[PDB]
């Protein structure tokens, strides 16, 4: 603020040593010692909150910087946050390697013949060989052959 931004407070002295991610929001007047605080006192009542001042004329080490600190966490649980992956175009009638999903395949691609059911992704024969895949983006059925 050109007249000084005093709304940005900070607590100079805490009751004990800080805990990782511990917050002090109370406006308690910090009785340092040798005399009880007793509401408001001159020598030993010692309010610890301090303003920033924050004029635009402040120095480089004194200018208001804005900081974002980020912390992730992992656990023995399903991972709810990941990073997106971009898929290339899909081709047909060529002996190619492909990764339509978490499964990895290789073979020639051909258009649909057999209708699927909506809650289905894998077509298999009697010998546990996958041969039908529904595309992720487009809802088209494709058949692979070795």
């Amino acid at each position: 603020k050109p007249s000084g931004n005093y709304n940005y407070l900070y607590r100079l002295l805490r009751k004990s040593k800080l805990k990782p991610f511990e917050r002090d929001i109370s406006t308690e007047i910090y009785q340092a010692g040798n005399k009880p605080c007793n509401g408001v006192a001159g020598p030993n009542c010692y309010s610890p909150l301090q303003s920033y001042g924050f004029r635009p004329t402040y120095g480089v080490g004194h200018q208001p910087y804005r900081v974002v600190v980020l912390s992730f966490e992992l656990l023995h649980a399903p991972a709810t946050v990941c990073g997106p992956k971009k898929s290339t175009n899909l081709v047909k009638n060529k002996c190619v390697n492909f990764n339509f999903n978490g499964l990895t395949g290789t073979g020639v691609l051909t258009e649909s013949n057999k209708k699927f059911l909506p809650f289905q992704q894998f077509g298999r024969d009697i010998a546990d060989t996958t041969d039908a895949v529904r595309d992720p983006q487009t809802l088209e059925i494709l058949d692979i052959t070795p």
Binding site: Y58, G59, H62
Partner: protein, 198 residues
């Protein structure tokens, strides 16, 4: 930075008005520094094309460099060791800038000019006229002020006392005697506003 002191804030130069302020707003022209506090300094003058303007600018930058040096020290400790140190360290940066080899290196002086013994002697004589000429005058002013403020010498013994050790201490005789009511050594600028000479 040839000496070794690092560069500082780029917003300071625009924050200091250096040319003639003009009549659009009243402003003084004494070259003065401003150590405003937490990372803010200003200089104030009206710059003209004089060599003494360069001397005063070097003096002001020495002052402000010493100002920002002790910025990490607290506000009560944000000064020199005593009062005379700041003026002294401004003065040595003021005088050291008048070296013609520096002016030739930076191109202020052309390399055709040369320094001889007699020119250096004249420069030393001018320096003695400025520096060591004022030293015994400052000495006897300080001594007279110390006997005055100590309250030891009588007030009414000053018929010729300041006159007589002006005659014998520095070798200056008054042309006309003065009576007791005169306080001419106490009539100077610094004693009138209680500014010390030590």
């Amino acid at each position: 930075v040839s000496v070794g002191l690092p560069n500082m804030t780029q917003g300071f130069w625009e924050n200091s008005m250096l040319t003639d302020p003009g009549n659009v707003q009243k402003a003084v022209c004494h070259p003065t520094a401003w150590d405003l506090g937490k990372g803010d300094f200003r200089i104030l003058m009206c710059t003209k094309v004089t060599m003494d303007d360069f001397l005063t600018a070097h003096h002001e930058m020495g002052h402000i460099q010493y100002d920002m040096a002790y910025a990490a020290q607290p506000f009560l400790l944000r000064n020199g060791a005593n009062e005379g140190f700041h003026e002294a360290v401004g003065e040595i940066m003021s005088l050291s800038a008048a070296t013609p080899k520096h002016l030739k290196s930076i191109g202020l002086l052309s390399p055709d000019f040369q320094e001889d013994n007699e020119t250096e002697i004249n420069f030393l004589l001018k320096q003695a006229l400025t520096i060591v000429g004022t030293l015994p005058f400052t000495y006897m002013l300080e001594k007279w002020r110390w006997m005055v403020f100590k309250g030891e010498i009588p007030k009414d013994q000053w018929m010729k006392k300041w006159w007589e050790m002006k005659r014998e201490i520095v070798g200056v005789v008054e042309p006309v005697p003065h009576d007791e009511t005169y306080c001419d050594p106490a009539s100077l600028f610094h004693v009138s506003n209680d500014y010390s000479f030590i």
